[PDB]
Structure 1
Amino acid sequence: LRNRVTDRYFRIQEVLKHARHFRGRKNRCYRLAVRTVIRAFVKCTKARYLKKKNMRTLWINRITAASQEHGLKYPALIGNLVKCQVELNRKVLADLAIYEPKTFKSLAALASRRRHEGFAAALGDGKEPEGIFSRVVQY
């Protein structure tokens, strides 16, 4: 024997250290620890996309709940806050709904106002003066 790996121990522990918290024989037997650790890291990588998707769907749910508390669906709130040129995103809308109820009450009132302005305008004949909140501000 001319050359023999003298440090296989550390190469094993580099992979077992990530498996101490697993369950079964696959937290101390390398042949199984490797496969499950690799699956673990692949899921760890692939899960960030789902993290973003899930937080966004949670925010949409919370905003739907808050907006329904004020007699106003979620399509209306977002599709008529932007028509008032307020670029509040959904994370901060959810935070406002939970932690600042009256500010969210005002935002819902603003959305309902703009919705009514839109309905009144479209109901009319022609280009009668625009609604007091429906006036765009240009850059």
Structure 2
Amino acid sequence: VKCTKARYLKKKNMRTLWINRITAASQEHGLKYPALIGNLVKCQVELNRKVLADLAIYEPKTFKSLAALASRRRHEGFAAALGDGKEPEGIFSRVVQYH
């Protein structure tokens, strides 16, 4: 019964471990975890927590590139909040439209 009930706890604990490792790497880059996840999904790059933690451990240059992307989209969102747009709605905004 413990072996059957352990599968849900395994999935939950693995995602909490990924959240801890991504928080560690982003806080090495001076970024918080919510800023990284939110502003990464706002550039339409859909990387899940598993490959983000694996990029954090094994490919730290690609993680620095991702942290720079998330910070730039964060800054664009802040300037858009001060200006309501007008002109450019940023550059690393402007989502690609699919039909």
**TM-score bracket for this pair, using the shorter chain length:** over 0.9
CA apart distance, 1:128:
2.6
- How many residue pairs match? The answer is 98
Partner of 1:58: 17
The reply to whether residue 122 of structure 1 matches residue 81 of structure 2 is yes
CA apart distance, 1:127:
4.2
Partners of 1:43 and 1:105 lie apart in 2 by 41
The reply to whether residue 97 of structure 1 matches residue 62 of structure 2 is no
- In structure 2, list runs of 5 or more residues that go unmatched: none
Runs of 4+, deviation exceeding 6 Å? none
Partners of 1:127 and 1:50 lie apart in 2 by 48
The reply to whether residue 80 of structure 1 matches residue 39 of structure 2 is yes
Q: 1:112 to 1:47 in 2, by over 3 A?
A: same
Q: 1:59 to 1:126 in 2, by over 3 A?
A: closer
CA apart distance, 1:138:
1.0
CA apart distance, 1:129:
1.5
Partners of 1:65 and 1:97 lie apart in 2 by 9
Q: TM-score, normalised by structure 2?
A: 0.96
Identity of aligned residues (%): 100
CA apart distance, 1:126:
5.0
The answer to which structure, 1 or 2, has the higher relative contact order (CA under 8 A, 6+ apart) is 2
Counterpart contact for 1:84–1:114, Cα < 8 Å: yes
Question: Can you list the C-alpha shifts for 1:61-94, whole angstroms capped at 9, x where unaligned?
Answer: 0000000000000000001000000000000000
Partners of 1:62 and 1:125 lie apart in 2 by 35
Counterpart contact for 1:121–1:128, Cα < 8 Å: no
Q: TM-score, normalised by structure 1?
A: 0.69
Q: 1:102 to 1:126 in 2, by over 3 A?
A: closer
The reply to whether residue 111 of structure 1 matches residue 80 of structure 2 is no
Query: Mean alpha-carbon deviation: is it higher for 105-114 or for 124-133?
Result: 124-133
Higher radius of gyration, 1 or 2: 1
